[PDB]
DNA sequence: GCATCCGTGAGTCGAG
C-alpha cells in the first residue's frame, strides 16, 4: 500500500521537535510570502 | 513493513571510478541519508491548530 | 530582493505596516530605507507573512526556513482500532486483547 | 469627493505568466479585492491532468518493467507534471498514447498527436529506455478541478490501469500587491497588482476572468433572502 | 495577553507640558510618542490618552480597525457611564467575557481590567464565574476565551 | 454543557438523584412510545435532519427538559411498582 | 472528478433595524472566508453615513475647556455628539448645520435641536448636556455625509475660529462579525458554513447594509473589463 | 533486649 501524509501521523526533526499532524490546509489558507509563495508547515514556537 | 528498494543512480555508458555509486539503497538520496523531506516552515502559532 | 526591485515592485503597504511593528519592536533601527529594515529582519532570519484567508499581513515578522523533518513509524492507520462485540477468551470468557 | 472605475493595465510574457494592475483604488481595497481573487485562483480555477495510466506487461504501480530505468512510481510521477493543453471546449477526456522502444530517452514529444490537443511542455522526461527496452504506454487525461486524489477517483480505462493523483489546477503561483498611490488631492490610496503564474494549459489572463466571475456568481448567492424559521 | 497588554514607550520621556495643545504640538513635531508617560497640568498622562477619546467600545475598536491606533495603544474610552483610561484590547477582552456570559455588570465586576490578562488573573476569572453565573455560562466563556486566545495568538506575530 | 444544568442541581438533595430521576423517566419514555410525555408539541426537543426538523430520538435529553418545566414528581415511595406499571400501560398503551 | 454543486440558501435572522444574523450554507471548501473577510472589510470602511465633523458653543475656547452651568465638560458632550444618529431623506444634501440655544434647569436631548428640511433624527431621546440654574448653552454642530472614520485631526475643519473639529463616525455599521463553521451536505463534511453578523446604528438595517457592501464588491469585478 | 533469616512486594494502555 502507498500511504500518503494524513491527519494523525507523526513527524519530527533531528533536534527533538516531534508531533502529529492536526490539520491539513489547502493552499490558500496557508501562511505566505511577499511573492506569493506558501509555507509546507507550521511549527508552533511554544514548542521551542 | 517498510519497503525497502535500491534504484539506480548511474546511466549506460557513464565512466565510474572506484567506489562511486551506482544505485540509490532506501532512504538515500545520491549516496547521502535521507530520514525524510526539506520542507519550507514557519513558526507562528495557528488558530490553536 | 533585488530581483523584486528589478522586477519593478517597491515596498507594499502591508510590509510598511510590519515594519512600523518591528520598528516598535526594537528588531529594526528607525530611519533607515524600507529594504534597509527588510534587510535587517531578514539577517535576524525573519520575513513578512501575509495570512492567505485574509490577505492582511502577520502583525510581526516571522521565522521562516527549511527545515529537515522525518515521517516516524507511528502511523494513525495502524493505531486506529474499535469494536461493538468479537471474539472472547476461553477460560475467563472476556474480549480478547 | 467619490472615487470611480480606476485605469486597468495589463502586462503578459507569453501564456504562461501575466500581470494585472487596477489603479487608483479607495483605502484597503486593494487587498479587498486582490486576496480573494488569489483563493479563487489558487483553488477553483478549472484545468487538465492526467486521471490514468496503462502500461502493457505492468500490473500495478509497485512493478519494474524491463529495459526501463526508472520504475513505475517515478514514472506516474513524471507524468503527474504532464500538461495538456485542449484546444477544444467541449472535450472532456482524451488519451494520449506512446509508443518507443530502444536505446533512448522518452520524452513528452513522443505521444502520438491528437486533434486538438497540445503539449505545452514537450521536454518533459518521462522515461529512459536501454537497448531492447521496450516501453508501450496509453495515459488517460481529463477536465477536473481542484485536488483529486488517485483514491478517491479510481478511474480506469481497462483492468490493468493503473490510478494516479490528479492536480487539475492550471494556475502554479499567485501574488498580489499593494503600492501606495494618489488622485489629485487624494492620498494614501491602493495601486493593485495581481501576479499571475500558470501551466500555459490556460493563460493567467483567462484564469484571472473566470475567477472573478466566479466571485461574482457567488456574490449572487446573497439575492434571495429567506426566512429563519428557528423561533 | 498579547491583545491586554499596554505600550511602554521611551520617546517622550516625561516631558512637563501647561495645555494639551501643547502636548498635541509636540508630538505631532515627533518630539514625544504617543504611549511615552508625560506630565500635562502637574497630573501624568500620555498623548494618546488626550488626542483620541472614544464615546463607546464599537468607535474605538472601529478606529483599531481603520487602523488609527492598535490594541495596545493606552487611550481614552467611554465603558458604562465611566471615562476610561485603558488600551482598546482591554476594552475587548471585557467585552468578549461580558458578551461570554451575557451579564454586562458581572463580567465588567469579574475583571480586573487594569493588569494584563496571564495564566493566574484567567484562572481568578474562570473560578470566579464559575461561583456568580454557573457552570454552563463558565463554559460557555471557557469556549469563548478559548476563540478569541488562538484567533489573536494567530496574528500576533 | 447539559442546558439548565444548575436548575437541575438545585431541585434535588443530591446530584446522583437527578441521576437517577432523569434515568428512569427516560426508560418510562421509551416504554411508552414518548406518548406519556409532559411537554407540548411547541416544547418538543427536535432533531434537524436532512428533510426537516423531526422530534429528538433522545430519550435523556426529553427528560431533563421534562424535569426543567417542573411538570414532574419525583421522590421515593410514591407509589407501589406494580400499581406504577399497571396505570401507565393503562393510559398509554404499548 | 466528476463534480456536483447545489447553490447555498441564504437565511436571515433580523431584531429590528439594530442587527441581523445572515447564514450563507452549504459553500465550497475555503469560500467561508473567501466571501467573509472582504465583505468585512467593505461594510465596515465604505457603507455610506453621516457624522458630525465640528461643533462650535459660545464662550468656549477649545476642547477642554469646562463650560460654566453645566455638568458635562465639553468633551464629554462631544462624546454625546458622536453618538447621534442623523438620517439625510435628500440624496442631494451633502452637509447641514444643526444650531441648539438653551438654558436654566433643563436636561437637553437630541430632540431639541431645530429641525432641519430632509433631515431624520433617529435618537432623539440621546442625552446631550444637563443645564443647571444660569447655565446657558448655544452651540451649532456640522453634519456632514462620509464613509467610514475620519479623526479629527484628519480633517481639520473649521466654519469659525472658535469651531472644534470631532472625529467623525460615518459608518452606519457598529461591527461586522462572522465565522466560518464546518457543515456537511450528504458525504463530505468540511463543506463551509457562513455565520455572518452586523451592527448598526438605525439608520441603515444590516439587511440594507450587507446588499450595499456586496453591491460594491461587485462593481469592482467589472473593473478587469476594459485595459 | 538486638542481630539475623525467609518470604513478598516493587505504575498504566499499547504490541508481543
Ligand atoms: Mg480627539
Ligand atoms: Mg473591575
Given at each position: 500500500q502507498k500511504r500518503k501524509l494524513q491527519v494523525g501521523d507523526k513527524l519530527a526533526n533531528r533536534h527533538g521537535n516531534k508531533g502529529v499532524v492536526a490539520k491539513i490546509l489547502p493552499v490558500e489558507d496557508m501562511p505566505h510570502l511577499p511573492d506569493g509563495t506558501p509555507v509546507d508547515v507550521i511549527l508552533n514556537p511554544l514548542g521551542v | 513493513g517498510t519497503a525497502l528498494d535500491q534504484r539506480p543512480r548511474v546511466v549506460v555508458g557513464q565512466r565510474v571510478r572506484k567506489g562511486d555509486l551506482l544505485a540509490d539503497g532506501p532512504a538515500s538520496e545520491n549516496g547521502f541519508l535521507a530520514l525524510g523531506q526539506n520542507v519550507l516552515v514557519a513558526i507562528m502559532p495557528f488558530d490553536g491548530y | 530582493f533585488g530581483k523584486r526591485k528589478g522586477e519593478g515592485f517597491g515596498v507594499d503597504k502591508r510590509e510598511v505596516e510590519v515594519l512600523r511593528r518591528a520598528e516598535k519592536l526594537g528588531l529594526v533601527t528607525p530611519g533607515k530605507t524600507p529594504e534597509e529594515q527588510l534587510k535587517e529582519l531578514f539577517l535576524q532570519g525573519k520575513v513578512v507573512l501575509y495570512d492567505?484567508?485574509?490577505?492582511?499581513?502577520?502583525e510581526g515578522p516571522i521565522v521562516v526556513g527549511q527545515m529537515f523533518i522525518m515521517k516516524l513509524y507511528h502511523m494513525v492507520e495502524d493505531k486506529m482500532h474499535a469494536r461493538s462485540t468479537g471474539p472472547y477468551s476461553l477460560i475467563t470468557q472476556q474480549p480478547l486483547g | 469627493s467619490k472615487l470611480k472605475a480606476p485605469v486597468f493595465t495589463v502586462r503578459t510574457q507569453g501564456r504562461e505568466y501575466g500581470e494585472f494592475v487596477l489603479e487608483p483604488?479607495?483605502?484597503?481595497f486593494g487587498v479587498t479585492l486582490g486576496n480573494p481573487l488569489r483563493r479563487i485562483l489558487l483553488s477553483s480555477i478549472p484545468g487538465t491532468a492526467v486521471t490514468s495510466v496503462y502500461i502493457e506487461?505492468?500490473?500495478?504501480?509497485?512493478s519494474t518493467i524491463p529495459?526501463?530505468?526508472?520504475d513505475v512510481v517515478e514514472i506516474i510521477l513524471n507524468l503527474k507534471e504532464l500538461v495538456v493543453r485542449f484546444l477544444?471546449?467541449?472535450?472532456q477526456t482524451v488519451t494520449l498514447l506512446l509508443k518507443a522502444e530502444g536505446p533512448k530517452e522518452v520524452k513528452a514529444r513522443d505521444f502520438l498527436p491528437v486533434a486538438d490537443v497540445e503539449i505545452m511542455n514537450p521536454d518533459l522526461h518521462i522515461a529512459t529506455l536501454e537497448e531492447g527496452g521496450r516501453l508501450n504506454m496509453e495515459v488517460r487525461v481529463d477536465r477536473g478541478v481542484g485536488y483529486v486524489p488517485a483514491e478517491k477517483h479510481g478511474?480506469?480505462?481497462?483492468?490493468?490501469a493503473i490510478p494516479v493523483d490528479a492536480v487539475?489546477?492550471?494556475?502554479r503561483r499567485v501574488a498580489f500587491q499593494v503600492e501606495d498611490t494618489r488622485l489629485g488631492?487624494?492620498?494614501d490610496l491602493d495601486k493593485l497588482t495581481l501576479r499571475i503564474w500558470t501551466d500555459?494549459?490556460?493563460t493567467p489572463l483567462e484564469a484571472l476572468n473566470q475567477a472573478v466571475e466566479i466571485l461574482r456568481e457567488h456574490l449572487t448567492y446573497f439575492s434571495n433572502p429567506q426566512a429563519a424559521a428557528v423561533a | 495577553y498579547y491583545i491586554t497588554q499596554v505600550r511602554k514607550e521611551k520617546?517622550?520621556?516625561?516631558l512637563e507640558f501647561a495645555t494639551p495643545e501643547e502636548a498635541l504640538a509636540a508630538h505631532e513635531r515627533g518630539?514625544?510618542?504617543?504611549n511615552a508617560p508625560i506630565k500635562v497640568a502637574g497630573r501624568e498622562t500620555s498623548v494618546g490618552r488626550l488626542k483620541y477619546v472614544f464615546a463607546n467600545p464599537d468607535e474605538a475598536l472601529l478606529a483599531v480597525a481603520h487602523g488609527?491606533?492598535?490594541?495596545?495603544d493606552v487611550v481614552t474610552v467611554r465603558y458604562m457611564g465611566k471615562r476610561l483610561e485603558t488600551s482598546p484590547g482591554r476594552i475587548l477582552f471585557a467585552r468578549i467575557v461580558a458578551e461570554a456570559v451575557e451579564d454586562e455588570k458581572v463580567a465588567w465586576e469579574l475583571i480586573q481590567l487594569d493588569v494584563p490578562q496571564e495564566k493566574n488573573s484567567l484562572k481568578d476569572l474562570v473560578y470566579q464565574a464559575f461561583l456568580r453565573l454557573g457552570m454552563e455560562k463558565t463554559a460557555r466563556l471557557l469556549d469563548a476565551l478559548k476563540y478569541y486566545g488562538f484567533t489573536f495568538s494567530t496574528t500576533s506575530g | 454543557a447539559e442546558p439548565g444544568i444548575d436548575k437541575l442541581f438545585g431541585m434535588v438533595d443530591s446530584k446522583y438523584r437527578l441521576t437517577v430521576v432523569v434515568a428512569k423517566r427516560a426508560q418510562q419514555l421509551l416504554r411508552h412510545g414518548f406518548?406519556?410525555?409532559?411537554?407540548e408539541p411547541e416544547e418538543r426537543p427536535k432533531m434537524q435532519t436532512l428533510e426537516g426538523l423531526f422530534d429528538d430520538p433522545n430519550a435523556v435529553t426529553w427528560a431533563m427538559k421534562e424535569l426543567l418545566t417542573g411538570r414532574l414528581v419525583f421522590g421515593?415511595?410514591?407509589?407501589?411498582e406494580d400499581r406504577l406499571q399497571k396505570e401507565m400501560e393503562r393510559l398509554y398503551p404499548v
Open positions: - | - | 492567505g484567508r485574509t490577505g492582511e499581513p502577520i | 483604488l479607495e483605502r484597503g506487461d505492468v500490473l500495478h504501480e509497485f529495459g526501463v530505468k526508472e477544444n471546449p467541449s472535450l478511474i480506469k480505462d481497462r483492468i490493468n487539475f489546477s492550471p494556475v488631492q487624494r492620498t500555459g494549459s490556460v | 520617546k517622550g520621556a516625561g518630539e514625544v510618542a504617543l488609527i491606533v492598535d490594541l495596545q | 406518548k406519556n410525555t409532559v411537554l421515593e415511595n410514591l407509589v407501589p
